[PDB]
Write a protein that binds this ligand. Structure first.
Ligand code: HEM
Ligand SMILES: C[C@]12CCC(=O)C=C1CC[C@@H]1[C@@H]2CC[C@]2(C)C(=O)CC[C@@H]12
Length: 452
């Protein structure tokens, strides 16, 4: 089979599609092209032929196999943000990615996952006691800021544990994400004119310098530690691996940064959407509250509770299915292969449109929010909110633990109200690297009213 998509109009075909991606944003452009052309089609970003695919069968093949364990993006963009062959997220060097990933995998499962449930709860408790930091005169809570601050505090106390300026680093992480999202698919021409990206360069430096202060302190505490194996964490694991010569200092520093930004970037927006959904679905709220009463009572949340929280689990799954944040996954072909019916040469970029896939393929009621979509056991080959296989979400299991832990401890204490008629559907969204609220708009606040 030949490949669907717009015509290569003697070099105008590539320029319109790239231009469309730059104007619309990656996400919306992906949804445009899948709607106009097939659910498996071809576009160009820069020179390279890039495939945009929403087919579940294609999705499954790509994530299953090792020869897709790469992403893509502007070399100049990735060098600017420090992700070019340095972290794991957009580390496209297969061998360097292979040797860096285990550090993330170990920290995000096993005992660290068990510690996280209680770390999350305590971190949210402490911030819910300090609601004055985040609440308006008219009682409006800045939930986005609240969630970002707990997510950072959570990540720090588990993976690094060095005291930091919580409020400042949060703003800096937001700055970093903007830079990341801005520069990721900009053409090489964009980087020639310097009064057009130096804005983002400063944002990257702001965060990287701030994290440097923290890693420097961490390095000192490690060198003067008696019981070194008694208090191991993610940052220490990397620093010792560097000392063995397995890792580069620059690489270590990017890993720590990537670990710290991950939850503030994705978890907080996800939980925000989840909280807006609770506010507008009172029947679903009741089920969750009754489940909390049955399973937990007024005991502290524990690791043994998380499996039992089935209703909430289904809620989290449905929220992610219906209103995703990470609705697209970027990959690259490392070997030639035939996929479904189409030829896919090595060096071909892939964008998997998982958001659209979750509205087309398996679910009974795809275009409405219902826990009925998860009333029967969902095959993981039709629902992929995290990705799977050798390059699936490193935090995929811990993320479920964290989301449960904070939803339990928040809803236990407060009823959530939305301002005016606002819902996830009415929120003005940016649909670029991720699907998130346009924060230049207002009416994003909530009202937290006590329970009992
Ligand atoms: C609701 C929250 C989250 C969602 C929806 C999410 C989703 C995803 C998805 C779809 C990917 C791409 C996987 C693929 O290519 O198949 C990814 C990658 C990744 N995630 Fe998450 N994730 C979440 C939370 C987290 C957390 C809490 C962490 C760690 C603190 C994390 C760390 C990572 C890392 C390091 C990668 C890059 C993996 C690699 O390229 O090897 N994620 N995530
Ligand atoms: C989950 C994630 C990493 C942790 C973080 O800090 C923020 C994000 C949001 C963008 C994700 C990314 C992982 C890689 C993804 C799936 C892509 O291939 C395109 C969009 C992108």
């Amino acid at each position: 089979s030949s490949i669907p998509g717009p015509g290569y109009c003697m070099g105008i075909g590539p320029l319109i599609s790239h231009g469309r991606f730059l104007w619309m944003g990656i996400g919306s452009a992906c949804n445009y092209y899948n709607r106009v052309y097939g659910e498996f089609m071809r576009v160009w970003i820069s020179g390279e032929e890039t495939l945009i695919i929403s087919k579940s069968s294609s999705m499954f093949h790509i994530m299953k196999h090792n020869h897709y364990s790469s992403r893509f993006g502007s070399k100049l963009g990735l060098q600017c943000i420090g992700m070019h062959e340095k972290g794991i997220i957009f580390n496209n060097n297969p061998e360097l990615w292979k040797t860096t990933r285990p550090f993330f995998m170990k920290a995000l499962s096993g005992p660290g996952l068990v510690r996280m449930v209680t770390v999350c709860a305590e971190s949210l408790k402490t911030h819910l006691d300090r609601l004055e930091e985040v609440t308006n005169e008219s009682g409006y809570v800045d939930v986005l800021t609240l969630l970002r601050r707990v997510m950072l505090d959570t990540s720090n106390t588990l993976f690094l544990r060095i005291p930091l300026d919580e409020s400042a680093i949060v703003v800096k992480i937001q700055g970093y994400f903007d830079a990341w999202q801005a520069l990721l698919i900009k053409p090489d021409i964009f980087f020639k004119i310097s009064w057009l990206y130096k804005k983002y360069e400063k944002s990257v430096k702001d965060l990287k310098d701030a994290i440097e202060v923290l890693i420097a302190e961490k390095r000192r505490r490690i060198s003067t530690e008696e019981k070194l194996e008694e208090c191991m964490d993610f940052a220490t694991e990397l620093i010792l691996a560097e000392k063995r010569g397995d890792l580069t200092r620059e690489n270590v520093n990017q890993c720590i940064l990537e670990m710290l930004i991950a939850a503030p970037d994705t978890m907080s927006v996800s939980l925000f959407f989840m909280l807006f959904l609770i506010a507008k679905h009172p029947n679903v709220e009741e089920a969750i509250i009754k489940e909390i009463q049955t399973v937990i009572g007024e005991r502290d949340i524990k690791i043994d509770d998380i499996q039992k929280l089935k209703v909430m689990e289904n809620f989290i799954y449905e929220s992610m299915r219906y209103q995703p944040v990470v609705d697209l996954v970027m990959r690259k072909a490392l070997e030639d292969d035939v996929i479904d019916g189409y030829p896919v040469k090595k060096g071909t970029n892939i964008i998997l449109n998982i958001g659209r896939m979750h509205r087309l393929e398996f679910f009974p009621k795809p275009n409405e929010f219902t826990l009925e979509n998860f009333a029967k056991n969902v095959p993981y080959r039709y629902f992929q909110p995290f990705g799977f296989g050798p390059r699936g979400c490193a935090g995929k299991y811990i993320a479920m633990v964290m989301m449960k832990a904070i939803l339990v401890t928040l809803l236990r204490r407060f009823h959530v109200k939305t301002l005016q008629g606002q819902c996830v559907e009415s929120i003005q969204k940016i649909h670029d690297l991720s699907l998130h609220p346009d924060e230049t708009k207002n009416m994003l606040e909530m009202i937290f009213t006590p329970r009992n």
